[PDB]
Amino acid sequence: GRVLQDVFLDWAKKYGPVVRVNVFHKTSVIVTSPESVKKFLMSTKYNKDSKMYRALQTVFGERLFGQGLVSECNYERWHKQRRVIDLAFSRSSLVSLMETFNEKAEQLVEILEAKADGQTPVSMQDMLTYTAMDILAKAAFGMETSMLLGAQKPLSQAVKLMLEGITASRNTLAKFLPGKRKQLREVRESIRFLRQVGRDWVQRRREALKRGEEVPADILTQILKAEEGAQDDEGLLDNFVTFFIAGHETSANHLAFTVMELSRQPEIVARLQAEVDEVIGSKRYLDFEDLGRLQYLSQVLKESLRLYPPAWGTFRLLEEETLIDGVRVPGNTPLLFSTYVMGRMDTYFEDPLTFNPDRFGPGAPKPRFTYFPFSLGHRSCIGQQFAQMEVKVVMAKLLQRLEFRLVPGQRFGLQEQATLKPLDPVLCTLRPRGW
Ligand code: HEM
Ligand SMILES: S=C(NC1CCCCC1)N1CCC(c2cnc[nH]2)CC1
Incomplete structure (x- = not known):
């Protein structure tokens, strides 16, 4: 249940705000002082x-990601x-996606209700992966993967193998x-499979446009626009892969x-359920303004990202020798900023292992450069609002309609x-709830 990032946390706790560590077998310095996080992440100089x-x-x-937006x-x-x-992520484009987020979240709940017999285990990790993929494929690419209907298992497997x-x-x-030759071939095959799915979906879009079919503008429209001036499509396919993976997994x-x-936080779940009941009641479709009224759910999701940030670190190149919090760091050193490590440091969060949504309550002092x-800065997530909206829609609907119980034995560790x-995989048994 421990990961490499816990060793970085151990080195930071032992040695201070600037500590040399080994990451991806390269030398890096992890920087954990808030003032240094601000200096380097908030300037386009770095x-x-x-x-x-x-x-x-x-x-x-x-x-794989090539020279797409992340890499x-x-x-x-x-x-x-x-x-x-950025044009694909304007406030207006996002609001237009609420139909997609509601549609797929309602589909997820209806499938789960059909399985809510109080005894059959359901992998919530898999069901949420299928929901997020169906949302991204439709919202970003105008395609229906139908993973919630059991389709596209080869695609879901390819994504799993390439992330491993x-x-x-x-x-x-x-x-x-030699024992891993099969495993490496299968990873390479899965990466080529995903780029070829990108070729197919791009051709479908270009053919639809050529036939004069109506096509609303979406993320795919902009990644195609970004490559208008291109010899070939490898740059476009880099952004197809980048958004296909980053936008769902x-x-x-x-x-x-x-x-x-939440499966071990009954008091917190009781407040969330009461909040959803008071704010959206039995409404089927959630409106943009409804999401903003689910204040405690927002706190819960923020605390979940403090303790369990899936994107755990980012790096900036320090080009020249610099004093950082009094430590002289050599030039050409990669600096690691880790919201995972800072979130688990008692120096920045009292009783760091306690899950307490009140850390993000009205009036609580906001974390300053200790949570990200x-x-x-400039390389922050272009999909932050997309993600925050889709996760709130899915959580609100699950809280409205289902009760979950984690299967005994499931662990709370990370990988x-x-x-x-x-x-x-967050195996749970389910029962229908409320109205
Ligand atoms: C909870 C969900 C998400 C989390 C925690 C998250 C986190 C992050 C983080 C930490 C970065 C910085 C990465 C780095 O510096 O290496 C980032 C960048 C990025 N994310 Fe996300 N992300 C999420 C959802 C999404 C979604 C839904 C999309 C797409 C629709 C997306 C697209 C991107 C892209 C394209 C970048 C690169 C932005 C740039 O450099 O201009 N993310 N994300
Ligand atoms: S493994 C990873 N970074 C690590 C390797 C590259 C260096 C930084 C840490 N990432 C990049 C960000 C990506 C993402 C961005 N938004 C949603 N997902 C998820 C996958």
Whole structure:
């Protein structure tokens, strides 16, 4: 139930705000003082370290995220893409996605209700992954993956294998073990499979447009626009993969962690249920303004990201020798900023292991540069609002309609498969609730 990030936490607790650690077998310095987080993340003077993002660019030799929006480290090349794709994330575009978030969240609840016999185990990690994928495929690409209907198992498996491969490739000796040759081939096959799905969905979009079919603008419209000037489609496919994975798997892990922790927090669940009952009652469709009224649910989701941030770290390149909190750090060193580590430091959060949504209550002092599950600054998550809205819609509907009980034996530990996620798949038994 322990992960590599816990060793970084141990080194930070032992040695202070600036500590040399080994990550992806490269030397890095983890920086955990709030003033240093602010200095480096809030200035465009500091950019991502390409050496650390190579683990996403290519995996076991096969191009995966390439130079898409997450893994492009050059400021100019990144900014050019960001400006174009930001258009797909305006307040108005997001509100137009509430129909999609409601539709798939209601579909999830209806499937779960059909399974809510109080004894059959349901993997909530898998069900939330299927819901997040069906939401992203429709909202971003205008496609129906229907994973909630049991379709596209090869695609869901390919995603799982490549995320495991990201972690294996950057931390293990798999590339040299004869026993792992099959595993490496299957990771490379899964990465090529996903880029070829991108080729198909891109062709479907171009053909629909060529036939004069109506096509609302979405994320795919902007990733196509960002590549207008391109020799070929590899850059476009990098952003297809980037948004296909980032736009569903991290939200799914956040939802799974929240369901896992809430299963042992009856008092908190009672308040959430009462809040949903008072705010949305038996309404079928949640409105944008409804979400803002679910104040305690927002607190709960923020506390879930403090203790269980799926995207656990970000790196900036320190180009020249610099004194950081009194420690002289050599030039060309990757600096690691980790919301996972800071969230578990008693220096920044009293009784860090206690799950207490009141840390994010009205009037509570806001964490200052000690909490950043979507990172901060210019390279912060372009999908933050998309994610916060979709997770709230799914959680509100689950709280309205179902009661969960974790299957005895399921653990509360973590595992790393690119991002952090529950070690166990959050197997639960369900019963219908309320109206
Ligand atoms: C709870 C869910 C999510 C979490 C915790 C999260 C977290 C993050 C973090 C920490 C970063 C910074 C990564 C880095 O510095 O290496 C980031 C970047 C990014 N995220 Fe998310 N994310 C979430 C959901 C999403 C969604 C739903 C999308 C897409 C629709 C998305 C798209 C992206 C992209 C494209 C970037 C790169 C932004 C840039 O550099 O311009 N994220 N996210
Ligand atoms: S494993 C990972 N980063 C690690 C490897 C590259 C260096 C930083 C840590 N990431 C990038 C961000 C990505 C994401 C961004 N938004 C949702 N998901 C999830 C996968």
